[PDB]
From a paper:
The Nef protein is an accessory gene product of HIV and SIV that is dispensable for virus spread in experimental ex vivo cell culture systems. Thus, Nef is an important factor for AIDS pathogenesis. To achieve this multitude of activities, Nef has evolved as versatile adaptor for protein interactions that lacks intrinsic enzymatic activity, which allows the viral protein to affect a wide range of host cell protein sorting and signal transduction processes. We thus chose a strategy aimed at wrapping the surface of Nef by the combination of different, physically linked, target domains and the iterative optimization of domain composition and linker segments.
Mutation of the RT-loop sequence E88AIHHE to VSWSPD (‘NI1-2’) or YSPFSW (‘NI1-3’) led to an increase of the Nef binding affinity to 179 nM or even 48 nM, respectively, indicating the enormous contribution of this region to the PxxPxR recognition of the SH3 domain. In addition, two long antiparallel helices α4 and α5 (residues Y85-K98 and Q108–Q122) of Nef form a characteristic hydrophobic interface for interactions. The accessible surface of helices α4 and α5 is separated into two parts by the highly conserved residues F94 and W117, whose aromatic side chains oppose each other and act as gatekeepers to form a barrier in the helical region. The mutant residues V90SWSPD of the Hck RT loop undergo tight interactions with the proximal region of these antiparallel helices, with tryptophan 92 of Hck contributing itself to the high binding affinity with 41 interactions to six different residues of Nef within a shell of 4 Å. Many of these interactions were mediated by stacking of the aromatic side chains W92Hck to F94Nef, as well as facing interactions to W117Nef. In addition, R81Nef in the PxxPxR motif of Nef showed direct ionic interactions to D96 of Hck and the side chain of Q122Nef made tight interactions to the hydroxyl group of Y89Hck (2.6 Å) and the main chain oxygen of V90Hck (2.9 Å). Likewise, the hydroxyl group of S93Hck was hydrogen bonded to D90Nef (2.6 Å) and D95Hck formed an ionic interaction to K86 of Nef. The 8-fold increase in affinity of the Hck-SH3 RT-loop mutant VSWSPD compared to the EAIHHE wild type sequence is largely due to multiple interactions mediated by the central tryptophane residue. While the site proximal to the PxxP motif harbors the central residues of the RT loop, the distal site covers a newly identified N-terminal helix of Nef (residues 60 to 69) with W61 mediating multiple interactions to hydrophobic residues L104, I113 and L114. Of note, the acidic cluster motif of four successive glutamates (E66–E69), that was reported to interact with the sorting adaptor protein PACS1, adopts a helical conformation on this structure element.
Numbering used by the authors:
A (entry chain B): 79 to 138
B (entry chain A): 56 to 155, 179 to 205
The structure:
Amino acid sequence: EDIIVVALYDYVSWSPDDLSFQKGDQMVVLEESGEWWKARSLATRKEGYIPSNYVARVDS
Amino acid sequence: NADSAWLEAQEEEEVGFPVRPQVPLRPMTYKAALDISHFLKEKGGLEGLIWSQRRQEILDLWIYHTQGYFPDWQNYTPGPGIRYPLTFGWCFKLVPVEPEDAEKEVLVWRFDSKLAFHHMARELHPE
């Protein structure tokens, strides 16, 4: 099932490949290879890389 | 008036105390350098800035602090004349200007879209 994370800080992307988010946004984690994870925004449905230390995993 | 890449970088170095963690390190690539070039072009503040070694370091540290790129990718070919970026993808070059009397070269940062397609550092050297 879905890995859900909550943003602890705002993050501004400088690239179409990276995903901007605001503190408190929830995201689904699609890939966790290294420290930059691929995620999808539940708000905007846009997808891309995020800094994993800006988010907290919740649930289960 | 814009909202400047230079003024943000400069203010971060002076205060030095972020409200959020340092993003993880990741390697520089052609696509990241290209994307950062376009972002800073559109943001404003780097185009036309008068070059110094300290200014370049301030900007490199800001890019490192914000996006995680270790600050050793922003190198240029040696003078004299135009200095071309050694990292292919980075679309800024350093251009001599008329001093507006010295005599050391005053340089400005200049965006150049042809740098996305012509690795001039390599098409003009061999290292």
